A paper describes a structure:
The phenolic hydroxyl of farrerol formed hydrogen bonds with two amino acid residues, Lys187 and Arg215, in UCHL3. We created two UCHL3 mutants, UCHL3–K187A and UCHL3–R215A, and then incubated farrerol with HEK293 cells that contained exogenously-introduced vectors in which UCHL3–K187A or UCHL3–R215A was expressed. In contrast to the UCHL3 WT, an improvement in thermal stability was not observed for the two mutants, indicating that farrerol directly binds to UCHL3 through the two amino acid residues. Further SPR assay with the purified recombinant UCHL3–K187A R215A mutant protein and farrerol confirmed that mutating the two amino acid sites abolished the binding of farrerol to UCHL3. Since the cocrystal structure of the UCHL3–farrerol complex revealed that farrerol directly binds to UCHL3, a ubiquitin–AMC assay was then performed to determine whether farrerol activates UCHL3 enzymatic activity, and we found that farrerol affected both Km and Kcat, by slightly increasing Km from 47.72 to 56.27 nM and significantly increasing Kcat from 11.99 to 19.64 s−1, suggesting that farrerol activates UCHL3 deubiquitinase activity. The in vitro deubiquitination assay revealed that farrerol promoted the UCHL3-mediated deubiquitination of RAD51 in a dose-dependent manner. Since we demonstrated that farrerol binds to UCHL3 through two amino acid residues to activate its enzymatic activity, in order to treat HR-overactivated cancer or overcome radio/chemo-resistance, it is likely worthwhile to try generating farrerol derivatives that exhibit an inhibitory effect on UCHL3 while still retaining a high affinity to UCHL3.
In response to DNA damage, UCHL3 is phosphorylated and activated by ATM, and activated UCHL3 positively regulates HR by deubiquitinating RAD51 to promote the BRCA2-RAD51 interaction. Here, we find that the deubiquitinase UCHL3 is the direct target of farrerol.
Author numbering: 6 to 146, 168 to 217, 220 to 230
The structure:
Amino acid sequence: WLPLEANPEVTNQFLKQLGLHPNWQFVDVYGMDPELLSMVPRPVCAVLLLFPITEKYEVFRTEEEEKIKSQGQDVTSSVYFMKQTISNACGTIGLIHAIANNKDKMHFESGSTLKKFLEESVSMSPEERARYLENYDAIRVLHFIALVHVDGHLYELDGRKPFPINHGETSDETLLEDAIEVCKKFMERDPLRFNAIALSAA
Ligand SMILES: Cc1c(O)c(C)c2c(c1O)C(=O)C[C@@H](c1ccc(O)cc1)O2
């Protein structure tokens, strides 16, 4: 599985292995301050956020799950969501969430293994996607989540949760800034360090 660190060079090597043309490359997001965001090449189509699992995460996510089940949320049918059943798989799952939800922006090489995996898993349930990932030997190389734009909304994709989380309106053009605002919200949940990479045009 992808190592549990925010490392663009390793993640881009993985993208190449998986058969993606390198006109999208991960970059570091050096921090949330606007002059740091300006160093991220645009467009951006995904942000991966790395953070440690804490007791606060477990308590908050339980509250959030109850809230969403009670109020409902909009998760459009186009969102690709894969459950996590193996801890150390969260980096690889993050990468899959980033590519699956941006498939039409991507250029896949002929025998691309990730292209194959995506075509075969587009109609699977999140649970089936987890099982297939476990089976799929060609995908072989403290928590990661993905932030993407789908159909006008900003989705958080965390395979430890039961579903995507809708964080409000966004667009392809404003995804980086809107994702960073969601990261600021996340960090308010715990009285840490910011560690993120962005999938950027190259
Ligand atoms: C339920 C829930 C989450 O879903 C997420 C993403 C969280 C938290 C949480 O409770 C936190 O409490 C800490 C947090 C975090 C994010 C960025 C960072 O640099 C350091 C910490 O992220």
